[PDB]
Structures are given as C-alpha cells and as structure tokens.
Amino acid sequence: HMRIAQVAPLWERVPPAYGGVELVVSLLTEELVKRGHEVTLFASGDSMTQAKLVSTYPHAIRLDPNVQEYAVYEALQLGEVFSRANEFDVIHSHVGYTALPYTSLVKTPVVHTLHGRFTADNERIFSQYRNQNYVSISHSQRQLRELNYIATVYNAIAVETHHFYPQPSDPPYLAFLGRLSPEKGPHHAIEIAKRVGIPLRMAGKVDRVDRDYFKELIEPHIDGEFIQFIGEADHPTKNALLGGAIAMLFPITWQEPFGLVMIESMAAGTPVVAIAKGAAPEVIEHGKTGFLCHSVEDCVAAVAQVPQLDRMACRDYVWQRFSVERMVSEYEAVYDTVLAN
Amino acid sequence: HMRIAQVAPLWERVPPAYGGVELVVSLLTEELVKRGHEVTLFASGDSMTQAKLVSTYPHAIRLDPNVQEYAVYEALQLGEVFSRANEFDVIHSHVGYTALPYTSLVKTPVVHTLHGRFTADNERIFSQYRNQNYVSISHSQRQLRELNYIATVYNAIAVETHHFYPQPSDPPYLAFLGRLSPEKGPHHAIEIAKRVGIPLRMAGKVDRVDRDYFKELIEPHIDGEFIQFIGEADHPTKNALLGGAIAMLFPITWQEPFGLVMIESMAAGTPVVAIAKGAAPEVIEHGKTGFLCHSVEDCVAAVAQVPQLDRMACRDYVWQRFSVERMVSEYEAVYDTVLAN
Ligand SMILES: O=c1ccn([C@@H]2O[C@H](COP(=O)(O)OP(=O)(O)O)[C@@H](O)[C@H]2O)c(=O)[nH]1
C-alpha cells in the first residue's frame, strides 16, 4: 500500500558474483513488490526487478572496465532519487553516509540501513546526522549508540535457491569464501587448514588496496593442491564450494557488520568455524551450526568436531532466523514507525 | 554588497605548499572581502581568511594521517553549505561535480568553477546538469560544448608576492615544479635536461597512485648529483627555484585545465618550455614568454634558444593577463549575470 524507493549501491548488479548489499536490496525489493507496494529501484541498468528500475548507467561499475570514477555515478543516483522526493512515502537508502545531507533537504522521510563498519572518520558525519532513521543489521554493529536506531533488522538470503548438500565432498576440503582482505583473515585460513591437515579451497575478489596483501601474503601459499584459489565465485560456484566443504573457515579480524557468507554456508548444510568478532556471535549458534573461536588453534580444534554437527539443522537454522519473509516484514514495520513520526 | 559563499576542496589549507585550487580560492576570497562583499569560506579549520570561516574538520586532509575518508568530510561540507543556502545571494563552488545534484534542491543560484579535466566518466554527470552555471578556467578545457558556460575566467596569482629575478643563476639549471605525476611529465623533464646537458632542479608532491610511477621512473634518476629534488616546496622555496632557472620545463601529457606553475615561473622572470597540450597555448606566448613544443626533442632544441627571451616581459605578461584584480572583477561580473537570470 505504500510508495517505496530502494537506493542500491551501483558497484554490483542488484548480483552475478560478489556483492552482499545488492543481494539484500534485491530480495527486499522483489518481496516488497509481491506484497503490493509501488517500488522504484535505483540501481545499475542491468539490474533485474519487477519494480520500476531507474538507472543512471547501463552496467554495474566494478566489473565494467570502461568506468572507474565511482563518485560520478553515486551523485547521479542521489540526484535522480532526491529530485523525486515527493514521488515516495518512504526512501530506503542502502548507500551509506553520502545520503545523509540530502535527507535534511527534502521532506520525504528516509531509512538508512547500515551496511558497513563505523570508523573514526564516518562517526563524525553519522554523529552530525544522529537523528535520522537508522537500521542496523546486527546489534554489535551499533558502536555509536548515540544514533536514532529504529530497529535491528538482520539480513536474509533466498534459502531455496541454495542446493542442500547432505554430506560433504570427498576428497575432503575446507572452504574460504570472501574478499581477500586482511579483515576476513584468509591468511588465518591457510594456517588453520595446514595445521589440521585438510586441503583448502579459497574463493573471492581481490581488489586494489588489498593487492599488496594478496601478492605478499596469500599468493606464495597457494601452490595448487593443498591450497587452491578458484578466484571469485558466482552463485552456483560458491554454493557448490560451500556445500561441498566440511566447514567454511571465517577467521575474521574486524568488527564484521553481518557476514552473509555464514548464512550461505549453513543453507548449503555446511557449518561455520568463525573467530568470535563482530556479528559472528549473533549469527553462529555455537555447538549447533558451527563454532565460535578466539584463536587459530581454537579453530583447528573446532574443525575436528564439525563432523558431529547436523548439516540439515544448519539449513533449518537459516530458514528460522535469516529468511527473506522475516526481513521484509521487519522492514515494513520500520517504514510504519518512520511514517507515523 | 553581496552575500557570497566560497566552497573550497578540503585537501589543502585555503595553501602551505602544494595546492592550486585552494590558492586561487584564497585569492578570490580575500579580495572579495576587501571589495566589501560578505563572504563565507567553507574550507578546513586551519584556513586563514578575513571572511567567515565555516570548517568541517580542523586540518587539511592530505597531510593529515588520522583521516582516510575524504568523502565523509566532503559530504559534511556540502551539507553545511546547502542547508544554509538562503544565507547567500550566490554560492561559488570549487569542489567539482558532487555539488551538481545539490544545486537542484535549493533555489539559491550556484556558480561552478571547473578546475579539472573532462573524462568519459564525468561527462555523464555534467551533461545531466548542462543548464547550470559553469565557469571554465581556459578555453581548451571546454570539451563538452553542450554546457551553460557563463564565462572563461583564467586563473591568477599574486604577482607582487613573487620576487623577480632579473638574471638566472650561474651555472644554469632547468626547473620542474609540480606534482610528480605522469600527467605533468617529470620523466620527460629529466630526459630533456640530460640531452640538453643543463642540470635539472625539481620539486613537488607524490600522492599515492603516482607512488609506483615515482619509484620506477623518477627515483632511479635522482640518486645522483646532477638531478636534485628537495620534495614539495613552499612559496619562498618554489619562487627561488623558478626564478633561478633559465627555464621551467612543462612537458605535460594531459589536457591540462590551466597550469598555475607556468604563470608562477613567468612572474619570477623565467620563461617556460611547454608541450602544447590543454591550456598551454593560451597561457604561453610562443617566442615571447616561452616556447610551445610537440615532443621531447622539440623541448631540447627550444631550451637552446631560451636566452633570447626577455625576462621582465615575462613578468609584465603575468601582470597584464593573470593578475588577481582581473580575475575577481571577472568573477563579480559572473555573479551579476547569474543573479540577473
Ligand atoms: O567470490 C565471492 C566472494 C564473495 N561473494 C559473495 O559476496 C557476499 C559477501 O558479503 P559478506 O556479507 O559475506 O561480507 P562483506 O564482503 O560484504 O564485508 C556474499 O554473498 C558472498 O557469497 C561471492 O559471490 N563471491
């Protein structure tokens, strides 16, 4: 019954392979349409949606090599969004802090879903716009506390679009799936697999800022066989990568906002061995769907106990707690509260 | 008799050493205050101004190591400027395309000085906002054609604050002054000085991105005595550098928007050997204040015929075309035209 704008990042298509945010914007957008709202989606032109697509460039920016200046396109899109404020009852921003100053200039209310970590720089602008409507994606993300949080709304995935692997592959292997940043601890993953004796199949994006970290600290240990790299996985690849593993290693070293790869692994039937930072304690059910750990050697021990976990319970777990219909109903509750203020 | 906002980039102080845009904004601002206008400067908090300073962070960002997210402070500053839009008769913006969509959300008219080069990427946003008030800083910069160009206002310097050097230093040397980027061609400047056999005395800034370029193509040549660097120079230093040389080399491989170092050299008495790209043909009068060349070896030959040029005429020329009085009077004409529409 409402007019809703969905403002998606433009890096990835609303996504073929890497890209958490645009995946969540997609599932939210399509479900809001099925529920009878009038939705406009602001994303790349290749985006697939039953909503009205407003696009400022025909291709997602990252995997296009003819485009580089991201900020040009963020400004175009912010332009197309807020020059149309009166066409919507609620504006759902997923693009982060650049949307904050526009919001004080139109009268249509705006919901900001926090998709990244709070930093020493970005706390400065968030604190300045502390009264705008925020949704966190985990309780641990909220490191400000000073902001007007409307709710925590946990992320979700389309569980049914992940094949379920009742039993891991043979020959046995461990999976790493994520961007090759020090924040995701893939250096720790090679450690863990070498220590415990089970090969590792890694996968993920390597982008500039991290190219030094890769070339120096990952590249020399991939030598095929025990450490295989694969290199950035699309949906069917990563489903088979995770489902086939006995455990997905998640040795993060940073205040992880949510960690969608954890719920994607459990949906395939594969529990997660994670370092207990950021949102991992909220997502993993220690002893049931994986193990919360505080060191590499905690992780190595957890891998030795994973065979005793029920793989089918890991999938059930994501249906209960991280399903799409829950997330969209919680966002619909946020829109109601915002609109009634 | 006008309330005028000046919105400066935040990378440099409105500038101790490197910084072209922020120097020009400074000169425009201070003079607009003397002519009686009521000016607000939006710049870093260490900026020195007789206008009202509204700052979003106490120090310039490039040489601050506790700041790593320029967009945060940019988005903050655009917020401060346009939320106060009706405190001003006109907003003079120097921060590029990120102000274009804001301009559609306020009634107060905006003037954009274009300080950079058109790219395949930024033409997409300027084209979307072609009816806005643009000032180009050279004629060769105007590569779009479809835009509402109010005027060309060439940049200026405070000629009097530059010591004039009637004779170059003996033994001779050549000068380079600029950021150590491929666009500025300091690799060419080294080549030219080696073929010519006069020593090079360089100076400038290495932002990262140019870091591998400096290490591979510049660093190996500066080790010796014949090339000298003393990196990143303040005003007394750069003046003495330029004034001492027989000629400043300006071997650009870019569509240079303007090129302040050329008028800074000419003011000290030093003519310019320049590659005839971007704004170079408009700023240099070939055969009088320098030479326009098409190649490296062109510059080698032209260095030989530099002593025939009249050093006082180089300073006369900057007073005649690139003085501050000219530039501010021309900018007031632009405010007048914008308000009358
Ligand atoms: O090679 C890869 C690496 C990652 N992803 C996906 O991109 C998202 C990563 O988001 P996540 O929440 O795990 O962490 P983030 O990178 O956003 O901090 C997940 O859907 C991954 O399945 C992918 O498709 N291919």
Ligand SMILES: O=c1ccn([C@@H]2O[C@H](COP(=O)(O)OP(=O)(O)O)[C@@H](O)[C@H]2O)c(=O)[nH]1
């Ligand atoms: O070590 C340096 C290098 C450059 N500059 C100044 O930085 C400005 C650069 O402006 P220009 O148009 O020449 O180059 P760009 O703005 O395109 O970087 C000029 O005032 C230079 O005098 C400086 O003070 N010190």
